[PDB]
Amino acid sequence: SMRQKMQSTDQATVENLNELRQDLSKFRNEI
Amino acid sequence: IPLQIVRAETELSAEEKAFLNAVEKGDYATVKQALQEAEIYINCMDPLGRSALLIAIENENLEIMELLLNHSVYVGDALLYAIRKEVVGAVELLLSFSEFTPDITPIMLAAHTNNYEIIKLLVQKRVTIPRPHQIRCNCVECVSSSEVDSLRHSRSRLNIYKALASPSLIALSSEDPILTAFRLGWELKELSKVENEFKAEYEELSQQCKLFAKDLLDQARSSRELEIILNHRDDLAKLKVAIKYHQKEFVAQPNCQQLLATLWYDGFPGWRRKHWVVKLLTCMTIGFLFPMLSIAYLISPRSNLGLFIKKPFIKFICHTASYLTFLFMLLLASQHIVRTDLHVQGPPPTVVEWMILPWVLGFIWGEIKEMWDGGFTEYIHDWWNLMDFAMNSLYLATISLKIVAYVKYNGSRPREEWEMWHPTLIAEALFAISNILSSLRLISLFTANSHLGPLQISLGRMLLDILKFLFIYCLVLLAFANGLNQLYFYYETRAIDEPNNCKGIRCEKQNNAFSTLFETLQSLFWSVFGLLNLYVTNVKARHEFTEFVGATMFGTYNVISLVVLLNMLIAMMNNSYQLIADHADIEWKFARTKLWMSYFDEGGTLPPPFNIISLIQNQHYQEVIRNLVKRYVAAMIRNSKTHEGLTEENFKELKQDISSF
Amino acid sequence: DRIPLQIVRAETELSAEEKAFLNAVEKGDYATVKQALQEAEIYYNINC
Amino acid sequence: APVILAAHRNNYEILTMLLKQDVSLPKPHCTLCSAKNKKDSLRHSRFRLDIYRCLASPALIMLTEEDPILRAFELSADLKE
Ligand SMILES: CC(C)CCC[C@@H](C)[C@H]1CC[C@H]2[C@@H]3CC=C4C[C@@H](OC(=O)CCC(=O)O)CC[C@]4(C)[C@H]3CC[C@]12C
Ligand SMILES: [Ca+2]
Ligand SMILES: [Zn+2]
């Protein structure tokens, strides 16, 4: 119950997706 | 102290380690690998307890969920979790430690979430919600459930009532959403008193229902739609139903108030445009001619003058003028010019009393008609009506006692020789009390003014706490009165032994103040206003201990009464007024609407001296309701949807088109 | 002992082709919308 | 101690992992403590408050105590004094 109390905006879900995207982009040019 | 990990979680196996990791990532090649692993063998759960299906639902990958269903994993409560997550696609796909209580159904959860699209989807399948029993139901099942498990019973009832009060569900499934909102709000308000444990939840639900009804009314775009809504009968029937259910915000809507104003001010176009001096002159000249208008209506009810008094504002002015004339005639009775002699035991009525008699009969007949027509229950709600009943009863008692005194006594006698319980004295006292009660009724006319109305309402709402304070003060007063009377009752002295034959504290030399309980209560009452002298605690026998104890008790009573309680009351009244001031406008408008509607009817046209002498309308209503609901749904969607939609379209569009390129 | 729930005011539902066109418009695929509109012109709805 | 700072943040995942290895925490109050207070009283007071803030962590009580309801009752009366 407590997790839903503060984890509701879910900004760190789309932000985590953006972080995966940036890691993939950095790998691309680096390789 | 080092302590230990008393509570832990079962470790994940190698297969469990491999699984839910690709599921969190969601790569479809890893999904093919998971399918291959399943063929090699899926139901493993994360430490949160969510299986593969639930976390796949969270990932919002419909293909993954479809593949999981093909593998025939345990569905469990996946539908409820999808409804809670409020994702339409997963709910549609599913249609094609337990988190929730066992009584929860998908439709109840959807109504709890108040999602219009999901509720529309589920209600297409024709789901049902169990109906609740009465608030005071005493049957076999209710008693068995309450005795076996009361907490679960209360929780189930609260869940059902919370599901039934969803604005989206009411809009979709109710034939008359406004009436349903009214009835549900009233019923939920009544349930809060019986179920004291869940008072806040029921109050919140009732407030939500009221707000939904008001916001549904707020979407009218023409006067024709407003008339159709307000005049619907299952004459302003809907307005009367709203008044009956205490829908203050619904009544105080500006458009409804404008319609009521144009109904009330009939015959006076552009009344607001006129300067206030012109308004005052018009009111005075209209109220001056009340007898002529009353007679004209009595003779020719359908002529111009006859129709003049049928308008609500003119009728109100005439009634006010008649009451003011009655009060002015009451003021002339106390003038000594009326009373020729004061030594007649049984006197005949004077001229002023003869003039006052028709008004008294008129008021009694009006109150009888009001009570009989409205019924006993409606009559007591006013509170003001109680005053009317008391005044009329006192007037009747005065008349009866006057007749008895006239019949019985037939001779002149000095007034100082009359006994204590002479009928004339009782009649005079009752008449004076009746005059006091009659003069205080003019406060009820303050609600018609925009300046003195809200103040009168606010002062009315502040009289509830003063009584609660007075109860505690009464306890304190009784305690101290008992103590003082117990101390001082031995030294009671007779009236002969005192100067001028006084006993009590209504004399220049106060005496015997604490000799009886009644006199002690009166003496302690008058000390609040400082009208009791300090020498009343003295004893003729001059005993020092008794006088010291009495003075100490009197001082303690004075300190407690005047230093603590009065300041506490001042602070409490300060706090209460600030909260009341916020909602003064709505309450005043509700009160003025109640006052106005009493003059719309044709029953009480004449003032007190002179009184004693279906399918087509339903089709139109359903058309208007259809338009209002459609506008309301779009407006509430706007606040919820635009920001979320824009944000989702940005990143999602960015992360797939680039991959395709 | 139960409350039946049913839609009282019913509105005509869109066709499958119109819903697919709506989803294509929402998904922002210009090629799919162009093909759908060309097929609509061939068969003789954007006004839906 | 790293565990003390972890309990200050009041979250479950790292607290469970860190406590998996055996970890002790000295209890707070003698003659020896009086000697330390003479040398540095500001540091002594700060350390005691640091420990009690770690002990009053909802995540730590749930994971380490057998009767979390009774532990919250006794600690609350302890901290008020
Ligand atoms: C105070 C004592 C000395 C009694 C003598 C005064 C009366 C003649 C006054 C006192 C209060 C008056 C009433 C106060 C307010 C109103 C509402 C008023 O309604 C409006 O026209 C309101 C217009 C607006 O909204 O501004 C009509 C007169 C009336 C009944 C007044 C009628 C005359 C009353 C009874
Ligand atoms: Ca009345
Ligand atoms: Zn029952």
Side-chain angles (χ1 to χ4, degrees), chain B residues 484 488 513-514 532-539 543 546-548 550-552 554:
Chain B
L484 269 157
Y488 269 102
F514 312 116
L532 193 79
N533 302 143
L534 288 178
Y535 55 77
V536 302
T537 58
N538 277 346
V539 170
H543 291 149
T546 297
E547 296 176 351
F548 175 78
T552 306
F554 195 54

PDB file of all heavy atoms in Angstrom, chain B residues 484 488 513-514 532-539 543 546-548 550-552 554:
ATOM      1  N   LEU B 484     -24.806  27.031  48.351  1.00  0.00           N
ATOM      2  CA  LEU B 484     -25.165  28.230  49.104  1.00  0.00           C
ATOM      3  C   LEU B 484     -26.467  28.040  49.875  1.00  0.00           C
ATOM      4  O   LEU B 484     -26.579  28.476  51.028  1.00  0.00           O
ATOM      5  CB  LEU B 484     -25.258  29.434  48.167  1.00  0.00           C
ATOM      6  CG  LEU B 484     -23.956  30.225  48.006  1.00  0.00           C
ATOM      7  CD1 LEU B 484     -23.947  31.002  46.702  1.00  0.00           C
ATOM      8  CD2 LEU B 484     -23.741  31.154  49.188  1.00  0.00           C
ATOM      9  N   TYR B 488     -26.936  28.492  53.951  1.00  0.00           N
ATOM     10  CA  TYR B 488     -27.621  29.663  54.490  1.00  0.00           C
ATOM     11  C   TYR B 488     -29.078  29.433  54.878  1.00  0.00           C
ATOM     12  O   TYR B 488     -29.751  30.397  55.254  1.00  0.00           O
ATOM     13  CB  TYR B 488     -27.556  30.815  53.482  1.00  0.00           C
ATOM     14  CG  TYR B 488     -26.365  31.730  53.650  1.00  0.00           C
ATOM     15  CD1 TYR B 488     -25.263  31.628  52.816  1.00  0.00           C
ATOM     16  CD2 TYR B 488     -26.350  32.704  54.638  1.00  0.00           C
ATOM     17  CE1 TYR B 488     -24.177  32.463  52.964  1.00  0.00           C
ATOM     18  CE2 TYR B 488     -25.268  33.544  54.793  1.00  0.00           C
ATOM     19  CZ  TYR B 488     -24.184  33.420  53.953  1.00  0.00           C
ATOM     20  OH  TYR B 488     -23.103  34.255  54.103  1.00  0.00           O
ATOM     21  N   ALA B 513     -31.572  36.191  50.547  1.00  0.00           N
ATOM     22  CA  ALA B 513     -31.167  35.876  49.183  1.00  0.00           C
ATOM     23  C   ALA B 513     -30.876  34.394  48.986  1.00  0.00           C
ATOM     24  O   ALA B 513     -31.026  33.885  47.871  1.00  0.00           O
ATOM     25  CB  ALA B 513     -29.941  36.704  48.795  1.00  0.00           C
ATOM     26  N   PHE B 514     -30.461  33.691  50.040  1.00  0.00           N
ATOM     27  CA  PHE B 514     -30.088  32.285  49.946  1.00  0.00           C
ATOM     28  C   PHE B 514     -30.906  31.416  50.897  1.00  0.00           C
ATOM     29  O   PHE B 514     -30.420  30.394  51.385  1.00  0.00           O
ATOM     30  CB  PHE B 514     -28.595  32.101  50.219  1.00  0.00           C
ATOM     31  CG  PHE B 514     -27.713  33.044  49.452  1.00  0.00           C
ATOM     32  CD1 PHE B 514     -26.941  33.981  50.115  1.00  0.00           C
ATOM     33  CD2 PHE B 514     -27.647  32.987  48.072  1.00  0.00           C
ATOM     34  CE1 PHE B 514     -26.126  34.847  49.417  1.00  0.00           C
ATOM     35  CE2 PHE B 514     -26.833  33.851  47.367  1.00  0.00           C
ATOM     36  CZ  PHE B 514     -26.072  34.782  48.042  1.00  0.00           C
ATOM     37  N   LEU B 532     -26.656  42.286  42.329  1.00  0.00           N
ATOM     38  CA  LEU B 532     -26.773  41.752  43.680  1.00  0.00           C
ATOM     39  C   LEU B 532     -25.691  42.376  44.547  1.00  0.00           C
ATOM     40  O   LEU B 532     -24.502  42.286  44.222  1.00  0.00           O
ATOM     41  CB  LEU B 532     -26.656  40.226  43.682  1.00  0.00           C
ATOM     42  CG  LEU B 532     -27.062  39.518  44.975  1.00  0.00           C
ATOM     43  CD1 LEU B 532     -28.572  39.407  45.076  1.00  0.00           C
ATOM     44  CD2 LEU B 532     -26.415  38.148  45.061  1.00  0.00           C
ATOM     45  N   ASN B 533     -26.101  43.000  45.648  1.00  0.00           N
ATOM     46  CA  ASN B 533     -25.166  43.691  46.520  1.00  0.00           C
ATOM     47  C   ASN B 533     -24.361  42.695  47.352  1.00  0.00           C
ATOM     48  O   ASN B 533     -24.740  41.534  47.523  1.00  0.00           O
ATOM     49  CB  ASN B 533     -25.906  44.663  47.435  1.00  0.00           C
ATOM     50  CG  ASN B 533     -26.700  45.697  46.666  1.00  0.00           C
ATOM     51  OD1 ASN B 533     -27.794  46.085  47.072  1.00  0.00           O
ATOM     52  ND2 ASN B 533     -26.152  46.150  45.546  1.00  0.00           N
ATOM     53  N   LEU B 534     -23.230  43.170  47.874  1.00  0.00           N
ATOM     54  CA  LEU B 534     -22.305  42.312  48.604  1.00  0.00           C
ATOM     55  C   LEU B 534     -22.699  42.085  50.057  1.00  0.00           C
ATOM     56  O   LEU B 534     -22.120  41.206  50.702  1.00  0.00           O
ATOM     57  CB  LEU B 534     -20.891  42.897  48.556  1.00  0.00           C
ATOM     58  CG  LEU B 534     -20.151  42.817  47.222  1.00  0.00           C
ATOM     59  CD1 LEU B 534     -18.786  43.470  47.334  1.00  0.00           C
ATOM     60  CD2 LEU B 534     -20.019  41.377  46.770  1.00  0.00           C
ATOM     61  N   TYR B 535     -23.655  42.841  50.594  1.00  0.00           N
ATOM     62  CA  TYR B 535     -24.036  42.660  51.989  1.00  0.00           C
ATOM     63  C   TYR B 535     -25.055  41.547  52.188  1.00  0.00           C
ATOM     64  O   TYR B 535     -25.440  41.282  53.331  1.00  0.00           O
ATOM     65  CB  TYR B 535     -24.578  43.969  52.577  1.00  0.00           C
ATOM     66  CG  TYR B 535     -25.725  44.603  51.822  1.00  0.00           C
ATOM     67  CD1 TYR B 535     -27.015  44.099  51.924  1.00  0.00           C
ATOM     68  CD2 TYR B 535     -25.525  45.727  51.036  1.00  0.00           C
ATOM     69  CE1 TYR B 535     -28.064  44.680  51.246  1.00  0.00           C
ATOM     70  CE2 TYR B 535     -26.571  46.318  50.358  1.00  0.00           C
ATOM     71  CZ  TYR B 535     -27.837  45.790  50.464  1.00  0.00           C
ATOM     72  OH  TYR B 535     -28.882  46.375  49.788  1.00  0.00           O
ATOM     73  N   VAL B 536     -25.500  40.891  51.114  1.00  0.00           N
ATOM     74  CA  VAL B 536     -26.472  39.811  51.240  1.00  0.00           C
ATOM     75  C   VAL B 536     -25.885  38.561  51.876  1.00  0.00           C
ATOM     76  O   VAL B 536     -26.641  37.676  52.288  1.00  0.00           O
ATOM     77  CB  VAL B 536     -27.071  39.459  49.863  1.00  0.00           C
ATOM     78  CG1 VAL B 536     -27.734  40.679  49.251  1.00  0.00           C
ATOM     79  CG2 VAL B 536     -25.999  38.905  48.941  1.00  0.00           C
ATOM     80  N   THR B 537     -24.559  38.465  51.971  1.00  0.00           N
ATOM     81  CA  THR B 537     -23.923  37.332  52.628  1.00  0.00           C
ATOM     82  C   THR B 537     -23.811  37.512  54.135  1.00  0.00           C
ATOM     83  O   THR B 537     -23.343  36.595  54.818  1.00  0.00           O
ATOM     84  CB  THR B 537     -22.529  37.090  52.044  1.00  0.00           C
ATOM     85  OG1 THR B 537     -21.733  38.271  52.198  1.00  0.00           O
ATOM     86  CG2 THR B 537     -22.620  36.739  50.569  1.00  0.00           C
ATOM     87  N   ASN B 538     -24.224  38.659  54.664  1.00  0.00           N
ATOM     88  CA  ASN B 538     -24.125  38.910  56.093  1.00  0.00           C
ATOM     89  C   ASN B 538     -25.214  38.162  56.854  1.00  0.00           C
ATOM     90  O   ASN B 538     -26.298  37.888  56.330  1.00  0.00           O
ATOM     91  CB  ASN B 538     -24.226  40.408  56.378  1.00  0.00           C
ATOM     92  CG  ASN B 538     -22.903  41.124  56.204  1.00  0.00           C
ATOM     93  OD1 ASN B 538     -21.850  40.494  56.120  1.00  0.00           O
ATOM     94  ND2 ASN B 538     -22.952  42.449  56.146  1.00  0.00           N
ATOM     95  N   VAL B 539     -24.914  37.834  58.107  1.00  0.00           N
ATOM     96  CA  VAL B 539     -25.828  37.125  58.991  1.00  0.00           C
ATOM     97  C   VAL B 539     -26.149  38.026  60.174  1.00  0.00           C
ATOM     98  O   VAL B 539     -25.256  38.676  60.730  1.00  0.00           O
ATOM     99  CB  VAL B 539     -25.229  35.783  59.463  1.00  0.00           C
ATOM    100  CG1 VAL B 539     -26.067  35.178  60.573  1.00  0.00           C
ATOM    101  CG2 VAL B 539     -25.116  34.816  58.296  1.00  0.00           C
ATOM    102  N   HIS B 543     -22.092  35.557  62.921  1.00  0.00           N
ATOM    103  CA  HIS B 543     -21.196  34.412  63.027  1.00  0.00           C
ATOM    104  C   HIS B 543     -20.118  34.548  61.959  1.00  0.00           C
ATOM    105  O   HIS B 543     -20.429  34.613  60.765  1.00  0.00           O
ATOM    106  CB  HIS B 543     -21.961  33.100  62.865  1.00  0.00           C
ATOM    107  CG  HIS B 543     -22.878  32.790  64.007  1.00  0.00           C
ATOM    108  ND1 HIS B 543     -24.051  32.085  63.848  1.00  0.00           N
ATOM    109  CD2 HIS B 543     -22.790  33.086  65.325  1.00  0.00           C
ATOM    110  CE1 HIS B 543     -24.649  31.961  65.020  1.00  0.00           C
ATOM    111  NE2 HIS B 543     -23.904  32.560  65.933  1.00  0.00           N
ATOM    112  N   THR B 546     -19.423  31.338  59.297  1.00  0.00           N
ATOM    113  CA  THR B 546     -20.456  31.173  58.279  1.00  0.00           C
ATOM    114  C   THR B 546     -20.361  32.260  57.216  1.00  0.00           C
ATOM    115  O   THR B 546     -20.448  31.982  56.014  1.00  0.00           O
ATOM    116  CB  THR B 546     -21.836  31.181  58.936  1.00  0.00           C
ATOM    117  OG1 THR B 546     -21.947  30.068  59.832  1.00  0.00           O
ATOM    118  CG2 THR B 546     -22.932  31.092  57.887  1.00  0.00           C
ATOM    119  N   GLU B 547     -20.179  33.512  57.646  1.00  0.00           N
ATOM    120  CA  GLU B 547     -20.066  34.612  56.695  1.00  0.00           C
ATOM    121  C   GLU B 547     -18.818  34.471  55.834  1.00  0.00           C
ATOM    122  O   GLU B 547     -18.851  34.755  54.632  1.00  0.00           O
ATOM    123  CB  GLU B 547     -20.064  35.947  57.435  1.00  0.00           C
ATOM    124  CG  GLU B 547     -21.352  36.233  58.183  1.00  0.00           C
ATOM    125  CD  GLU B 547     -21.283  37.510  58.992  1.00  0.00           C
ATOM    126  OE1 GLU B 547     -20.180  38.083  59.105  1.00  0.00           O
ATOM    127  OE2 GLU B 547     -22.331  37.939  59.518  1.00  0.00           O
ATOM    128  N   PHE B 548     -17.708  34.032  56.431  1.00  0.00           N
ATOM    129  CA  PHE B 548     -16.485  33.830  55.663  1.00  0.00           C
ATOM    130  C   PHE B 548     -16.678  32.758  54.598  1.00  0.00           C
ATOM    131  O   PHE B 548     -16.283  32.937  53.438  1.00  0.00           O
ATOM    132  CB  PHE B 548     -15.336  33.463  56.603  1.00  0.00           C
ATOM    133  CG  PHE B 548     -14.061  33.109  55.895  1.00  0.00           C
ATOM    134  CD1 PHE B 548     -13.246  34.098  55.370  1.00  0.00           C
ATOM    135  CD2 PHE B 548     -13.673  31.786  55.759  1.00  0.00           C
ATOM    136  CE1 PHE B 548     -12.072  33.775  54.719  1.00  0.00           C
ATOM    137  CE2 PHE B 548     -12.501  31.457  55.109  1.00  0.00           C
ATOM    138  CZ  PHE B 548     -11.699  32.453  54.589  1.00  0.00           C
ATOM    139  N   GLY B 550     -19.529  31.736  53.250  1.00  0.00           N
ATOM    140  CA  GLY B 550     -20.451  32.224  52.238  1.00  0.00           C
ATOM    141  C   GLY B 550     -19.803  33.201  51.277  1.00  0.00           C
ATOM    142  O   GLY B 550     -20.018  33.128  50.063  1.00  0.00           O
ATOM    143  N   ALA B 551     -18.999  34.129  51.805  1.00  0.00           N
ATOM    144  CA  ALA B 551     -18.311  35.085  50.946  1.00  0.00           C
ATOM    145  C   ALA B 551     -17.314  34.387  50.031  1.00  0.00           C
ATOM    146  O   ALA B 551     -17.186  34.746  48.855  1.00  0.00           O
ATOM    147  CB  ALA B 551     -17.612  36.144  51.796  1.00  0.00           C
ATOM    148  N   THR B 552     -16.599  33.385  50.551  1.00  0.00           N
ATOM    149  CA  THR B 552     -15.656  32.648  49.716  1.00  0.00           C
ATOM    150  C   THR B 552     -16.372  31.907  48.592  1.00  0.00           C
ATOM    151  O   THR B 552     -15.916  31.919  47.442  1.00  0.00           O
ATOM    152  CB  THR B 552     -14.849  31.671  50.571  1.00  0.00           C
ATOM    153  OG1 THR B 552     -14.232  32.381  51.651  1.00  0.00           O
ATOM    154  CG2 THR B 552     -13.773  31.001  49.737  1.00  0.00           C
ATOM    155  N   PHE B 554     -19.315  32.672  47.256  1.00  0.00           N
ATOM    156  CA  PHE B 554     -19.823  33.661  46.309  1.00  0.00           C
ATOM    157  C   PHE B 554     -18.710  34.187  45.408  1.00  0.00           C
ATOM    158  O   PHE B 554     -18.901  34.337  44.194  1.00  0.00           O
ATOM    159  CB  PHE B 554     -20.495  34.807  47.065  1.00  0.00           C
ATOM    160  CG  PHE B 554     -21.343  35.691  46.199  1.00  0.00           C
ATOM    161  CD1 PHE B 554     -22.349  35.156  45.416  1.00  0.00           C
ATOM    162  CD2 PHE B 554     -21.134  37.059  46.171  1.00  0.00           C
ATOM    163  CE1 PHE B 554     -23.129  35.969  44.620  1.00  0.00           C
ATOM    164  CE2 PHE B 554     -21.911  37.876  45.375  1.00  0.00           C
ATOM    165  CZ  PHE B 554     -22.909  37.330  44.600  1.00  0.00           C
TER     166      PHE B 554
END
